[PDB]
Amino acid sequence: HMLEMIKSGKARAHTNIALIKYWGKKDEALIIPMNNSISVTLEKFYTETKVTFNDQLTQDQFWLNGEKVSGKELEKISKYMDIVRNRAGIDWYAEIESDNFVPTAAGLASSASAYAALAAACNQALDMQLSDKDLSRLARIGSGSASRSIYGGFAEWEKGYSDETSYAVPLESNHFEDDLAMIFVVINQHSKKVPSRYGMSLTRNTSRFYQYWLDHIDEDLAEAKAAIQDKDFKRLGEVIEENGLRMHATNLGSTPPFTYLVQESYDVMALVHECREAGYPCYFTMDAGPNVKILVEKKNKQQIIDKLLTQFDNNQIIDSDIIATGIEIIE
Amino acid sequence: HMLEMIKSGKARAHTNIALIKYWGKKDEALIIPMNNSISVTLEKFYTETKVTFNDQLTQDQFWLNGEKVSGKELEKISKYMDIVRNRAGIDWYAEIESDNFVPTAAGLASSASAYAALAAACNQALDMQLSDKDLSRLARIGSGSASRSIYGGFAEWEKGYSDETSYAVPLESNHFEDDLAMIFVVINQHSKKVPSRYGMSLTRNTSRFYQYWLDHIDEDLAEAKAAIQDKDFKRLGEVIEENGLRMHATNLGSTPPFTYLVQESYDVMALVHECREAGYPCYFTMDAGPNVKILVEKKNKQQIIDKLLTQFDNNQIIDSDIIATGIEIIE
């Protein structure tokens, strides 16, 4: 009977945002990055994924938010699933049922929560009994950012140099996370975005300013960790802000050059400058798109939102706390 | 009789575009730059200025393209005229009649040609008998880029260290200019631009990435000068292209960050990349606004234009050869 045979599991993983950036791969196939990255795991945003391995199935199936997935997005997950199958030592195809509590039409990325959730769900389903390290490795090979979403709070993706040594590790921050939040200003762009995978490889392999990135990253890593250790908010925010801008500076050197940023991105940056000037510490970062994310202390969260509303619509403004705990299995 | 008494002169100065950039003043009031710059003087674009000093005149008057100028622009030129009066040793007010053959509503800057033509017209009018050096100085203190337009072909603004030592000098290029042209792609952005004077001061004083500019500028000058002496187009083209992109990289680090570039700027850059791939060497540069300028060999000018027209409107595309001779007095 099916209920004797099927192997199944369900997990919930939250998104994380990179404060110290992953930008450029050393190894493209294996998703080994050129540098370590530091992230913060967000409470509001997650993916919940169920996976059901069944011997009778001939293809993987994938549903996202109740809609059957077809095309290259299904092709992509089936490739990932061959890796999970290879690792578990099992040949059964699977039905994947996933729900995103991530506003990705708002251009919020779900890659991070999607493969952490799927890895966690497979680990459950197939009784792989993976450590967090091994679980982070499995998420990493589908999406680099997802390695980090095994953990709550502050996480560091250790680059390593092979499939075995590249994974995320929890950063000790002594509940520093509990005082902080992030504000997202969602921004609509006319032009279709440069896709992140293509975009970072073009820059990493091609940019006349990529050395600038590599020259400063280890400093930024040590500085970020040290401010985290010391619960120094201004010191952390300053590194992360210049870090993200340098990430973006590098795209300007690529052959040919490109930008993730639009004028409205810059308008949010001006408002966060005015906010600091006004006595409210907060710091911006941008990923592979025009949206601006703002690290703030919870004590000033509303003060920052009020200033943003003088310039931006209420529907453009989302916030989240930092969730202190890691990946959850749904029982 | 008025004709016994009045002192008048008329000149034509052409615009110049910087290939190795002026970006950052060491001294604001005196317009001393943080670094040398190398420009090419353009044949198609220019200003013609007549000045008439008259002893009955109680105020300076300024007509541009036959329209009377009032407000801040008149104020600005009367300040400049005060300097010219002081240097000449005369106290007579003047009537300035200027015609721009530069399309400035297209965002092409006339600062370069306007203060050179004015300085040259005053030097005639008042019989200052200024060397090319001292004339370049006089232009410099109204607009920095204008120092360079005393010369045709290739010119270098030597930063010096005072009002006396900061001026432009002609570069020996052995008729390299004659083989070259520039294409302008005019771009209409829908935000108002950051004014250049304010923009370069904010960045010079504030940018997290401005050290990067200064760390690379001397090599870039030496390299550009070397490729000019050697008539090496691709070698010149490569430095001038990276040089301009680094200029823009700097504004990204300012407090708060800004950009001169818009999406359409980037599209022009993608097209010059494709032109190079297709066998047509050309190289792009950008100033304090979104227009893209393309340095090309004349043999390939039409070819780049044809490729630009697959993407851009005919009215967006202006070209110019490099004029080899310097500032002209009229009569």
**DSSP per residue over B31-49, as a string?**
TEESS-EEEEEEEEEEEEE
Select from B304, B160, B190 the least CA-distant residue to B237.
B304
User: Do the Cβ atoms of A209 and B245 come within 8 Å?
Assistant: yes
Of A253, A259, A272, the CB nearest to B266: A259
Contacts of B272 in chain A (CB under 8 A): 256
Question: Buried b vs exposed e over A93-104: b needs ≥16 C-beta within 10 Å?
Answer: bbbbbbbbebee
What gap in Å lies between CA A148 and CA A169, rounded to an integer?
7
What gap in Å lies between CA A133 and CA A158, rounded to an integer?
10
Kindly state the tokens that stand for A160.
Answer: 């390593």
Domain with CATH 3.30.70.890 in chain B: 186-331
Kindly state the tokens that stand for B145.
Answer: 């880029």
| Chain A, nearest residue to B212 by Cα | A212
Indicate the class that CATH gives domain B1-185.
alpha beta
Distances (CA, A) of B235 to B175, B223, B227, B281: 17, 8, 6, 10
Kindly tell me the number of DSSP H helices and DSSP E strands found in chain B.
9, 14
Contacts of A252 in chain B (CB under 8 A): 245, 248-249, 252
The contact set of B with A (CB < 8 A) is 191, 208-209, 212, 242, 245-246, 248-249, 252-253, 255-259, 261-263, 266, 269-270, 272-273
User: Do the Cβ atoms of A257 and B242 come within 8 Å?
Assistant: no
User: Do the Cβ atoms of A252 and B258 come within 8 Å?
Assistant: no
What gap in Å lies between CA B111 and CA B118, rounded to an integer?
11
Select from A15, A32, A21 the least CA-distant residue to A224.
A21
Instruction: List residues bridging with A27 in a β-sheet.
Output: A32
Kindly tell me the number of DSSP H helices and DSSP E strands found in chain A.
9, 14
Q: What is the homologous superfamily of the domain A186-331 according to CATH?
A: GHMP kinase, C-terminal domain (3.30.70.890)
Greatest Cα pair distance in chain A:
67
How many beta carbons lie within 10 A of that of residue A319, not counting itself? 18
- φ, ψ (nearest 5 deg) of residue B18: -70, 120
**Nearest-CA distance from B76 to chain A in Å?**
29
Q: Is B261 exposed, middle or buried (0-12, 13-18, 19+ CB in 10 A)?
A: buried
Instruction: Give the position of tokens 């008998």.
Output: B129
Encode A167-225 in three state secondary structure: EEEECCCCCHHHHEEEEEECCCCCCCCCCHHHHHHHHHHHCCCHHHHHHHHHHHHHHHH
**Nearest-CA distance from A222 to chain B in Å?**
18
Q: Is the dihedral of CA A225, A226, A231, A234 positive or negative?
A: negative
Q: List own/partner pairs for A255-259 with CB under 8 A and 24 or more apart.
A: A255/A202, A255/A206, A255/A207, A255/A208, A255/B273, A256/B266, A256/B269, A256/B270, A256/B272, A256/B273, A257/B245, A257/B266, A257/B269, A258/A194, A258/A199, A258/A202, A258/B266, A259/B259, A259/B261, A259/B263, A259/B266
Q: 3-state class of B164 per DSSP? A: coil
Interface test with B, best of A192, A216, A219, A252 (most B CBs within 10 A): A252
User: Do the Cβ atoms of A253 and B245 come within 8 Å?
Assistant: yes
Q: Which H or E element spans position A276?
A: helix A263-277
What gap in Å lies between CA A252 and CA A299, rounded to an integer?
36
Q: What is the DSSP letter of B325?
A: S
User: Do the Cβ atoms of A209 and B246 come within 8 Å?
Assistant: yes
Q: What is the DSSP letter of B135?
A: H
Q: Is A252 exposed, middle or buried (0-12, 13-18, 19+ CB in 10 A)?
A: buried
Give residues with Cβ within 8 angstroms of A282, minimum separation 6.
A183, A237, A272, A275, A276, A294, A295, A296, A297, A300, A304
Question: Buried b vs exposed e over A45-73: b needs ≥16 C-beta within 10 Å?
Answer: bbbbbbbbbeeeeeebbbebeeeebeeee
Instruction: List residues bridging with A114 in a β-sheet.
Output: none
User: Do the Cβ atoms of A261 and B266 come within 8 Å?
Assistant: no
What gap in Å lies between CA A225 and CA A235, rounded to an integer?
10
The contact set of A with B (CB < 8 A) is 190-191, 208-209, 212, 242, 245-246, 248-249, 252-253, 255-259, 261-263, 266, 269-270, 272-273
DSSP string of B183-221, one letter each residue:
EEE----SSPPPPHHHHHHHHHHH-TTHHHHHHHHHHHH
- Amino acid occupying residue A240: I
Elucidation method: X-ray
What stretches of chain A adopt beta strand conformation (E)? 7-20, 25-27, 32-33, 37-53, 61-64, 67-68, 94-101, 154-158, 167-170, 180-185, 282-285, 292-297, 317-321, 328-329
Contacts of A208 in chain B (CB under 8 A): 242, 245-246
| Chain B, nearest residue to A274 by Cα | B256
What gap in Å lies between CA B188 and CA B107, rounded to an integer?
8
Gyration radius of chain A's alpha carbons: 20
Resolution in angstroms comes to 2.3
Kindly state the tokens that stand for A199.
Answer: 């975009």
